[PDB]
Amino acid sequence: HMVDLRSDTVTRPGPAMRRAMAEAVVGDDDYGEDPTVHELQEKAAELLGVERTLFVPTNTMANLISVMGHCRRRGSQVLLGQECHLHVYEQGGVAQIAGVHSHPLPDLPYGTLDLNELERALTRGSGSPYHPVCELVYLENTHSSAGGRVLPVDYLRQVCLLAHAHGARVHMDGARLMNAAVALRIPPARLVEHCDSVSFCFSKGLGAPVGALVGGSKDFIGEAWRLRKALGGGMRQAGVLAAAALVGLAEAEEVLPRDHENAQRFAKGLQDLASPICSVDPATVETNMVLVQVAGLPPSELCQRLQAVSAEEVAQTGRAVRVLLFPWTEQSVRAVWHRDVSAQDTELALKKWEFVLRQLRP
Amino acid sequence: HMVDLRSDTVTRPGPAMRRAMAEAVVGDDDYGEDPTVHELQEKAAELLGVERTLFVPTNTMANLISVMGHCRRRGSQVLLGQECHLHVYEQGGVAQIAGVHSHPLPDLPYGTLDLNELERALTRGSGSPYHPVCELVYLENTHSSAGGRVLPVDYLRQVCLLAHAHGARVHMDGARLMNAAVALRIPPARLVEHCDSVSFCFSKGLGAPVGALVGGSKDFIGEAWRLRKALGGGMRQAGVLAAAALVGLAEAEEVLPRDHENAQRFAKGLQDLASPICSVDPATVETNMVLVQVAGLPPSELCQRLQAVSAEEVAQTGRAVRVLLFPWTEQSVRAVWHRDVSAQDTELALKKWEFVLRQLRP
Amino acid sequence: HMVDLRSDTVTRPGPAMRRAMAEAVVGDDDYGEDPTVHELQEKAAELLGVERTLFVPTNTMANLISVMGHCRRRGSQVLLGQECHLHVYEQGGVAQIAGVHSHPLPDLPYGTLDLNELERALTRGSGSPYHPVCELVYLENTHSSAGGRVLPVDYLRQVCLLAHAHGARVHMDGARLMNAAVALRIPPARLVEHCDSVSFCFSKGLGAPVGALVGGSKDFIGEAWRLRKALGGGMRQAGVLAAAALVGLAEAEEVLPRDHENAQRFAKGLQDLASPICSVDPATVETNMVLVQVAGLPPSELCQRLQAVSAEEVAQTGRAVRVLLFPWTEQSVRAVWHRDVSAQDTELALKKWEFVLRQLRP
Amino acid sequence: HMVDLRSDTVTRPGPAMRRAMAEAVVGDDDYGEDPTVHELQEKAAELLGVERTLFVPTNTMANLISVMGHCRRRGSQVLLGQECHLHVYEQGGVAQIAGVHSHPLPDLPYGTLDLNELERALTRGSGSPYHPVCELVYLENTHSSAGGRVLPVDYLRQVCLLAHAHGARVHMDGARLMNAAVALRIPPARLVEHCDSVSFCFSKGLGAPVGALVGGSKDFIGEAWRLRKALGGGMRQAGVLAAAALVGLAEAEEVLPRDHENAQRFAKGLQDLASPICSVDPATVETNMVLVQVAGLPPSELCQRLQAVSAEEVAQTGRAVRVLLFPWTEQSVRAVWHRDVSAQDTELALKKWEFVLRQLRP
């Protein structure tokens, strides 16, 4: 048996999604003739509170388009977090493709940036010609590398006040924005109100196979089209993909709460083991991610043992469960939940974790 | 009734394709865990005679990845045609994204480049440090802007001899490579043998909704992966799209011959009208495209009249056919055939053309 | 004896220039505290009829700054000539540094672009989002590769009318602008009136060791400063160089006429030889350059023989003159005059040419 | 009277330098025909222990060329300090020109990078294709923003061991490398032994008006030539500037010690005042810079008062000294010494500082 908690991107299409793709009404999106893509873009615009949206192949391209759309001036700068996904896991595309300078600030704690450090940075070269012009403050909600932490609304409000005062825009990587809205029990628009543009990903917790989009004003999306075209994201009959994304958008408020509960149950379960090797504070499990601190064992070996199966596992547990995880830091692993991990899969992953921990107990 | 000959990208998925998408076995392609994508990449590699292939969202990204993969040296240059699709209809991405210099040579005649001009250009800065280093010769087969002209094998052989002598690679934009192979009645590999890398598009004549790929050696595709990632083409469960592309690849040798026949029938039909306004040489209709020369009427108005319907059309023709076309040059329009244009649609488009021509006859 | 006609860049500083450098009042130009640089920028602004000017190290950087200043929009395009210096002999910097697309048009004939082809190109993607936006028309006066041909004022007037109608700017590479003004016997401002920005080079015919500048409006030069800084052209005590440039600017109207006369004398002299190997039309020698057509001998060997000295040369000529020249095309060489080539040096170069031609006469 | 301690770039040429420029033997450097430039490049290569050197207009271009020379791979990364000059005061050229990603690490303390953080960063994506490839570790000696701190030899040795193990090169911004060599009383080559390439600036403490250069192997300088050309640093008769740089290179070991003594005298003098507003630890004044901590007064106003002159200054001091300084941080100012600040100017600047401090004493 397999329980894959490496990422929520591994979500596979359900039967309602598979039917929607085979029954999609499509056209050439490059000509603006795909009705299902237009339906997705209009519904997502209403959900996010933006004027327009633009369907793209990946959330990577959506972030890259947004940065290029705000930071067009030669000698522009993005203020972002040093552990945000754009700065670490996107090939440095801000530089090698957008040609924009990046100024990273510490964000590990709770995915938030120190408002004092952010103000000092926004003021350093706010008018001096010797410094690059900060045209964008880049935010990520939820913050992936911090464990799926939720950015509060008031923090988002303070960032926009600080950015819009120094003549900068605000973009929010909302690759897991619905995970944040459900955690706060607020409509997603309340978070997007405090930003100029937003990314939104269907291929993670929502369960769609392919797709993301850029949200913003008409003018910003108007120029996002040319950038999508130049990067090679201007597909033809994309309504096949948008049909599946429409299904996941409707099931979001019902599917995502179960991912948060399963992650919280796992964190509480690991805590109830009182192991001197693994330590988790369930109060830090805000969404679908659990960061487990490891001691005395390299995190890679913990993932290797949890993925392997032994005859003694079948003895003291009963089942043979292969738990898939990623080593995150030098002293921690990361578990991500999604709709293909059932609550019974979660209990089985807890039992595998008990067995592995016991077989190496100091 | 609608007969859309603007482009072969408007092909809509058939029932076999719609079923394949709903029945696709998928995984995360970013982890290399989608079996249907791997099946498409292996079959296409055997079809094209390359070591590996890499599925991408669009043929635009496939060309951009190839140029970036060959022209990485700072101060690199691409030798290409001044009417090739990359140089005209791709937002100048060779420059604004790849940062590579372009040297266009005349290609309008038959999509071919003068081998003397190509040799003189390859020799100008072949060793001088004052000139950019030519690292790629860019070819397009079939050539779109010239009317779908087929590049002969011997011409491809001479280009590689000239390019590989001066230390340059050869990439072939094969957005309509199967249209060329069927026209020559040869396996597609015979054309790809004379190039280092190749693009291949499923979303045109093959009929798939979304998808293209890069073909080449293992090492070239190995680095194409990082470039696909940075540009935002690294999708997750792309096996949904690759399932439809596998169907069109199997129906290619049976679907494309009908597109060439319908285009040839139309060109002969227009010729049998002997109109002093429209003139076509059917000998120039090598694939699925027909360039119609217009006189005394702006090509935009000809497209407007062919798209419109009048009561007199219903009189002298019987049916109300809306023929969709694009104005190509200042004195010509362009018609492109595909599997959604039936042979009976072709005859109806001929009758609409007769009516329009007669109602403005000088 | 050496007569170096390879280029007019080989001009060495005179005693008045050497004194001006040692007596220059200088400061930190980066702080705007060098008075001699400010004096040069103000005098050149009055000479060219622009609002401001910005001293730069090379004419290469001046052209690169101008292109970057006009073509900042992502997906911008420059319309230029396929034999202009920017497109051929500047490492493709428009692409690898500015990230701008280039659309070259034929200019070899007389350094001019066909106004019909220029209008058809400016109209192709003037409003379509599928094409790059043409934001600059790039002109070169005098045109180097064509033999120092002068662009007429009326042609410059027609280009601006055509460019400013389609929302594009006009930049003029005036690396040899004074050579054109003296040829037309008009103030240099009459040429710059028909452009938005201009380059101007002191290190060629004017005789300065180092220096060039960008001319334009206050706002354009204001942003040219940031670009000069980013490229590494923001020098400190540049008044040392600007002092020598001020001397050459004052001697221009007296030094350059002698270069045109010496070149014209050489062209007439070569014609009076009636050789079936070398042919020049003196009517094509508009400035300080002479293109000599060669037959039966590779142009490289002609340069080798003219540079070499034999005992038979000392016999039938009397002196041993080493004439330095560059092979230009496959059938032509290029001679460029400057202030370090005296009129007596010109006669000696004619005699060397007679001897070489006679010793291989068919 | 003026005492300008804003920067050491304000050094003006001396009479020996002014004579050297007027007596320089020059040629076209673009053709490699300037003997004085070749003399400077050979002497500097012997001084630095590198194979070749390449004269450039500014130290900004020298750093930009080096980064571009090492980080050519698409998706390359530079590891540097977040307060190094390249990352803060160079328009973000690593991004907007070189297209390279930057990973800044904390360096403020002593200009050094934590070897553990540097190892963790070099190991994160050392082999993973999901991360950019670190091809350069960027060091600055002396570190400007930290107060001219000297990087020890052993630290340089440990950085190269760590960088060369993970397949990265090491470049050292030696804008003030001679200030470090004199401080350590070691030949400059001992520092350059622990790097692959080096920058070296003549226009600061050495006193030359214009000039810098890149040092490295033959192959690295060979490609630096093409990059210098593309950026517009390929000057013609640069031997005018190289003659002055040769004079400053010979006077370095005699001029720079006086700048360190004057700075140390000032730091001790300010300390002997025991003011609760200004505080300096003379042990932190390693070279020609003094960072003065300010309290109760914004650093801009302290610079304003020290620059202004009052009748009460002429009373209690005797002279009217205008001390020029830059505000550095929110709580500190920065003073930089050079050969145009005499030791008697230093004492006068101390007396002005006493007067200003006393007139606002809490």
Numbering used by the authors:
A (entry chain A), B (entry chain A), C (entry chain A), D (entry chain A): 39 to 400
The authors write:
Reactions 1 and 4 are catalyzed by two Fe2+-dependent dioxygenases: TML dioxygenase (TMLD) and γ-butyrobetaine dioxygenase (BBD), which are related by homology; reaction 3 is catalyzed by trimethylamino butyraldehyde dehydrogenase (TMABADH); reaction 2, the aldol cleavage of HTML to generate glycine and TMABA, is catalyzed by HTMLA. However, a mouse protein absent in humans (threonine aldolase; Tha1) catalyzes the reaction more efficiently. However, the preferred substrate of Tha1 is HTML with a catalytic efficiency in the order of 104 s−1 M−1, followed by L-allo-threonine (102 s−1 M−1) and L-threonine (101 s−1 M−1). As we found that the mouse enzyme has a strong preference (1000 folds) for HTML towards threonine, the name hydroxytrimethyllysine aldolase (Htmla) would be a better descriptor of the mouse gene.
To verify if the results of our screening for Tha1 are confirmed or improved with the availability of an experimental structure, we decided to determine the crystal structure of mouse Tha1. Mouse Tha1 crystallizes in two space groups, in orthorhombic F222 and in monoclinic C2, with one molecule and two molecules in the ASU, respectively. Tha1 did not rank highest based on the AlphaFold model, but its rank improved to second place using the experimental crystal structure we determined at 2.26 Å resolution. The PLP cofactor is visible only in the monoclinic structure; however, the active site is very similar in the two cases, with only minor differences. The expected tetrameric quaternary structure is formed by crystallographic symmetries, with four identical units in F222 (related by a 222 symmetry) and two identical dimers in C2 (related by a two-fold axis). The RMSD values between the single units (around 0.26–0.28 Å) indicate that the monoclinic and orthorhombic structures are similar. Also the tetrameric assembly is conserved in the two space groups, with two main interfaces. As indicate by data from PISA analysis, the interface between units A and B (analogous to that between units C and D, termed “main interface”) is contributing stronger to the stability of the quaternary structure in comparison with the interface between units A and C (analogous to that between units B and D, termed “secondary interface”). Hence, the tetramer can be considered a dimer (AB + CD) of dimers (A + B and C + D), with the first dissociation being ABCD to AB + CD (as determined by PISA). Interestingly, the Tha1 ranking in our screening greatly improved by using the crystal structure of the mouse protein or AlphaFold models built taking this information into account.
